[PDB]
Ligand binder design. Structure first.
Ligand SMILES: Oc1cccc(-c2nc(N3CCOCC3)nc3c2CCN3c2ccc3[nH]cnc3c2)c1
Length: 840
C-alpha cells in the first residue's frame, strides 16, 4: 500500500502533473471527477476482449477506393509470409479473412496450437473477422505501390496488459476588492471590475463597479445586484469577473455559479486570475492561476405553417455555422422549434436561439430534447456533432446529444478526430462530461487511440495552466486502465524524450551557424546518452506500431535552422524488419508544435474527405507530437529536400531559379524514365493537394525553404508555426514557375500534364466544398484552442470566403482557377521578397 503510493508517483511523472496536489482548488470537483470516472474505467476495461485488445487490429469498414482497386489485377493479392530464414508467398482474394488463411498454410499449403500473423518490423497485426482489404496496413502497402510482408508467430499475452487491482431574489455578488503584490504599471490609471453572468459565450447580464484609483490593493465592499433571478440560473452558467482599466482588459477569472452537485455556490472566494498578453478557449476556464505569488486576486462573497416562413426558416437552416442569426431569425427558430426539430442541420442554430437565462424556456428546451427521435435516427454528421461541442454550447443535455452521435463512429474515425475532440474538452463547463468519458472508453477500448490520447492530453498538460488540472484527471483516469504493458511503454517513451529534450536545450545555448566542437560536442552527449541510460528500445510517439532502439550516432546532427533542432536517426529495434534504413526524428525547442499538430491533422481529415470521392492527392502529413513547452518531435520523411536548397545546387546563394532545375534534380534521381513518370505523376498530384489544402486553410503564401519534395516526386509543406499572422504584394498560395516547367509550361502555355493539375485541383476544391460545414467547425475550433493571438472572428471569416460559401459549383471553379493565375501572373515576385525578408 506504500507500494501503491510509490506507483501513484509513477502515474504522476508520466502525466507531468500531480492530481492529488490540492494547492490550486476551492472545491472538490477535480477529486469528485477522479472518483466519478472510476466507473467508466472499470466498465470499458471489463467489456473489452483482451485478445483483440492486445493485438489492436487496425481496421476500417469503408469502401476500398476507386483509386486503389485499379492497383489489383485478377482480384487476387500477394502476402509474403516469413519465418526464421524461411518465406512463402500466397495468392489471396481481397476478402480472405485472417482466418481464411489459418487453413491455407497449416493445412492447405503445408494437437497443433494457435499462432497468428504480424507485419514485419511493426507491432501491427492481422487478426479478427475483417476482410483483408479492411486492414489499414494492407491499404497502405497497396496505395504506396508497396508489397505486404508478415511474420507468422506467437500472439502477445493478454496477461501482459493486465490492469492492476483496486428563491426569487435577484442574484447578488459582493466585490470586496483586488490585490497584486507588485503593480508593474507606472502610469497610474483607474480600474473597475466587471461581473458578467455568462452561458456559452452569451452574456446574460453585466454589472461593473465604479472606477477607482489603481493601487496594489483596491477595496469596494459593494453588492452588485443582477436582474437575473437565481431560479433562472442555468447549470453551467459562469460568473466571469474581469478587470478593466482606463480602456483595456487586463485580468479575468471565472467561477461556475452552479457546482458539480447542482448546488448554488455559497461562500467567500479569493480567486487568482490570469493576465492578458499584449475568442480563445483559455478565456473560459474554471481553473484559477496556480501562481499565487505573482497573480492578481479578486475577493468576492456569495450569500443566498405558411410558405414564406417555412422558406425563411429553411433559408436560415441552410446557412453556414458562422452565419450570425439575427433576433428575427432566433425568434422564428424558437417559435417554430417543433418543425426545426425535424431537421438535424438546424440543431445548432435552434439551440443557439434559446434564452438560456430563463428557467421555463430551458424547461421547454429540455422537453424538446426528449423528442429527438429524428435526431437519434439521422446518420452521423461529424460537422454537426462537432458544432454542438464548441464554445457556443454549454448545456450538458445539448452537449450530450452530440456525444451520442460520436458513439456510432468506428475507431478509424475516432483517430481522425481525436485531436479536436480532446481540444473540445476545453469547452466543457465541468471536469466530468460525456465527452471526457467518451474519450476515456475509446481510449481504453483500443490501444491505438489509447496511445495517442495519452500524448494529446500530455501535450496540453505541459503547456497550459488554464487546463492542466482537468486534462490531468482524465489522463490519470486513462492510465489506471490502459494496463501494465502500455504503462511500461509510456514510461519508456517519457524517458527517452526527457533524456533528449535535455540534450536539445544545452545545444541551443552554445550557438547564435555550426561549430566544429558543437557537432562533436553533440556527438559526445549522444554518445554519453547511449552509453548506459537509454532504453533498449522505445515506441515512436507518432508511429506507435514502430519501435526504435540504437542511435545511429554518426548520422545525427544539429540542423542549420533558425532555432537549433536535432536531426536524429535511430536503428529499428525489430529484427524481423525489412531493412537497415533508420528512423529519423527531428527534435525542436523554439516553436509551438501544437499548431503544427492541429494543421497536420486537419490535413489527414482532408485526405479522407477525398477518399469518399476516390480522389487521392498524395499528401505527406508527417508525424509531429508536441511533448512539452515550445518543444516536441517531428517525423523525417526519408529522401526529401526543400525547394530552397534545390536552388543552391545549380544556382547558389541568391537568385531567381532556373525554371528547369527541379526536373533536372528529378531526372537526376529517377534511375529510369520508366520511374520518372511516377515522379512528375506524384508531384502534380501532391502539388495539387497542398495548393488546395493551403489556400483553404489560409497558409498557402509560404517561403520555399518551408516546402519539400521527395526523390520520388512527392511534394509537401512543413513547419506551420504562427504562419497565420495578419497590403504588400500577396500570392494566394505557392504555385511558382519551377513547379510549372515540371508540368511543361510558360506564362501562356497549357500541357497535357497541366490541364490535369488545372482539372484535379478544381475537383479537389469542390470535394472540400461538399463539407463546407465540417471544415468551418474544425477551423474555427483550431483558432480558439491552438493559435493564441487569433483573437478576432474576422480571422475565422477567412475560411468561408476561401470556401466561397453559398455559391454555385461553377462560379467557385472560376474563383479558384483565377487564384492559380495570380500565382502565374506573379512568378517569383513574392518569393524574391521573402529572400529579401529572410534577410531584411
Ligand atoms: O512541422 C514542422 C515544424 C518544425 C520543423 C519542421 C521541419 N521538418 C522537416 N522535415 C519533416 C519531414 O521530413 C522532412 C524533414 N525539415 C525541416 C523542418 C524545419 C527545418 N527543416 C529543414 C530545413 C532545411 C532543410 N534542408 C534540408 N533539410 C531541411 C530541413 C516541420
Amino acid at each position: 500500500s506504500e507500494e501503491s503510493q510509490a506507483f501513484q508517483r509513477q502515474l504522476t511523472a508520466l502525466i507531468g502533473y500531480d492530481v492529488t496536489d490540492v494547492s490550486n482548488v476551492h472545491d472538490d470537483e477535480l477529486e469528485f471527477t477522479r472518483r466519478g470516472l472510476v466507473t467508466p474505467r472499470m466498465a470499458e476495461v471489463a467489456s473489452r476482449d483482451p485478445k483483440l485488445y492486445a493485438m489492436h487490429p487496425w481496421v476500417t469498414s469503408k469502401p476500398l477506393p476507386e483509386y486503389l482497386w485499379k492497383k489489383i489485377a485478377n482480384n487476387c493479392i500477394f502476402i509474403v509470409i516469413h519465418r526464421s530464414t524461411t518465406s512463402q508467398t500466397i495468392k489471396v482474394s481481397p476478402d480472405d479473412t485472417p482466418g481464411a488463411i489459418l487453413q491455407s498454410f497449416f493445412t492447405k499449403m503445408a494437437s497443433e496450437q494457435d499462432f497468428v500473423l504480424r507485419v514485419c518490423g511493426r507491432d501491427e497485426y492481422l487478426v479478427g473477422e475483417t476482410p483483408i482489404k479492411n486492414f489499414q496496413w494492407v491499404r497502405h502497402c497497396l496505395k504506396n505501390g508497396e508489397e505486404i510482408h508478415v511474420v507468422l508467430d506467437t500472439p502477445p499475452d493478454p496477461a501482459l496488459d493486465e490492469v492492476r487491482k483496486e428563491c426569487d431574489r435577484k442574484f447578488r455578488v459582493k466585490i470586496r476588492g483586488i490585490d497584486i503584490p507588485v503593480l508593474p504599471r507606472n502610469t497610474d490609471l483607474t480600474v473597475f471590475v466587471e461581473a458578467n453572468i455568462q452561458h456559452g459565450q452569451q452574456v446574460l447580464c453585466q454589472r461593473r463597479t465604479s472606477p477607482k484609483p489603481f493601487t496594489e490593493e483596491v477595496l469596494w465592499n459593494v453588492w452588485l445586484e443582477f436582474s437575473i433571478k437565481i431560479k433562472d440560473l442555468p447549470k453551467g452558467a459562469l460568473l466571469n469577473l474581469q478587470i478593466y482599466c482606463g480602456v483595456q482588459l487586463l485580468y479575468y477569472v471565472n467561477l461556475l455559479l452552479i457546482d458539480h452537485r447542482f448546488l448554488l455556490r455559497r461562500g467567500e472566494y479569493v480567486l487568482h486570475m490570469w493576465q492578458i498578453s499584449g475568442f480563445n478557449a483559455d478565456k473560459l476556464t474554471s481553473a484559477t492561476n496556480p501562481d499565487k505569488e505573482n497573480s492578481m486576486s479578486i475577493s468576492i462573497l456569495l450569500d443566498n405553417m405558411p410558405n414564406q416562413l417555412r422558406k425563411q426558416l429553411e433559408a436560415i437552416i441552410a446557412t453556414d455555422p458562422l452565419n450570425p442569426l439575427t433576433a428575427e431569425d432566433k425568434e422564428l427558430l424558437w417559435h417554430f422549434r417543433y418543425e426545426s426539430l425535424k431537421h438535424p442541420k438546424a440543431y445548432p442554430k435552434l439551440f443557439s436561439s434559446v434564452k438560456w437565462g430563463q428557467q421555463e424556456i430551458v424547461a421547454k428546451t429540455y422537453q424538446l430534447l426528449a423528442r429527438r427521435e429524428v435526431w437519434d435516427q439521422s446518420a452521423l454528421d461529424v460537422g454537426l456533432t462537432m458544432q454542438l461541442l464548441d464554445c457556443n454550447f454549454s448545456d450538458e443535455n445539448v452537449r450530450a446529444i452530440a456525444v451520442q452521435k460520436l458513439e456510432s463512429l468506428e475507431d478509424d474515425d475516432v483517430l481522425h478526430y481525436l485531436l479536436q475532440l480532446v481540444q473540445a474538452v476545453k469547452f466543457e463547463p465541468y471536469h466530468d462530461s460525456a465527452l471526457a468519458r467518451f474519450l476515456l472508453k475509446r481510449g481504453l477500448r483500443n490501444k491505438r487511440i489509447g496511445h495517442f490520447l495519452f500524448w494529446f492530453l500530455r501535450s496540453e498538460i505541459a503547456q497550459s495552466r488554464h487546463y492542466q488540472q482537468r486534462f490531468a484527471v482524465i489522463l490519470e483516469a486513462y492510465l489506471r486502465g490502459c494496463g501494465t504493458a502500455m504503462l511500461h511503454d509510456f514510461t519508456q517513451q517519457v524517458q527517452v524524450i526527457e533524456m533528449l529534450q535535455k540534450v536539445t536545450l544545452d545545444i541551443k545555448s552554445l550557438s547564435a551557424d555550426v561549430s566544429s566542437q558543437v557537432i562533436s560536442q553533440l556527438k559526445q552527449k549522444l554518445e554519453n546518452l547511449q552509453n548506459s541510460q537509454l532504453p533498449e528500445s522505445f515506441r515512436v510517439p507518432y508511429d506507435p506500431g514502430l519501435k526504435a532502439g540504437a542511435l545511429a550516432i554518426e548520422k545525427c546532427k544539429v540542423m542549420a535552422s533558425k532555432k537549433k533542432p536535432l536531426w536524429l536517426e535511430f536503428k529499428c529495434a525489430d529484427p524481423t524488419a525489412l531493412s537497415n534504413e533508420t528512423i529519423g526524428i527531428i527534435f525542436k525547442h523554439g516553436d509551438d508544435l501544437r499548431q503544427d499538430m492541429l494543421i497536420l491533422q486537419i490535413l489527414r481529415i482532408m485526405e479522407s474527405i477525398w477518399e469518399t470521392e476516390s480522389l487521392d492527392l498524395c499528401l505527406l502529413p508527417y508525424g509531429c507530437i508536441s511533448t512539452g513547452d515550445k518543444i516536441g518531435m517531428i517525423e523525417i520523411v526519408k529522401d526529401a529536400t526543400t525547394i530552397a536548397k534545390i536552388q543552391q545546387s545549380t544556382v547558389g546563394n541568391t537568385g531567381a531559379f532556373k525554371d528547369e532545375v527541379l526536373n533536372h534534380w528529378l531526372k537526376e534521381k529517377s534511375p529510369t524514365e520508366e520511374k520518372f513518370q511516377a515522379a512528375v505523376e506524384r508531384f502534380v498530384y501532391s502539388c495539387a493537394g497542398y495548393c488546395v489544402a493551403t489556400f483553404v486553410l489560409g497558409i498557402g503564401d509560404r517561403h520555399n525553404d518551408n516546402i519539400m519534395i521527395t526523390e520520388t516526386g512527392n511534394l509537401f509543406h512543413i513547419d506551420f508555426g504562427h504562419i497565420l499572422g495578419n497590403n504588400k504584394e500577396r500570392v494566394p498560395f505557392v504555385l511558382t514557375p519551377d513547379f510549372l516547367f515540371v508540368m511543361g509550361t510558360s506564362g501562356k502555355k497549357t500541357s497535357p500534364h497541366f490541364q490535369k493539375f488545372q482539372d484535379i485541383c478544381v475537383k479537389a476544391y469542390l470535394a472540400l466544398r461538399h463539407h463546407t460545414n465540417l471544415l468551418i467547425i474544425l477551423f474555427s475550433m483550431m483558432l480558439m484552442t491552438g493559435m493564441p493571438q487569433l483573437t478576432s472572428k474576422e480571422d475565422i471569416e477567412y475560411i468561408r470566403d476561401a470556401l466561397t460559401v453559398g455559391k454555385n459549383e461553377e462560379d467557385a471553379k472560376k474563383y479558384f482557377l483565377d487564384q492559380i493565375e495570380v500565382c502565374r501572373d506573379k512568378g517569383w515576385t513574392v518569393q524574391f521578397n521573402w529572400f529579401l525578408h529572410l534577410v531584411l
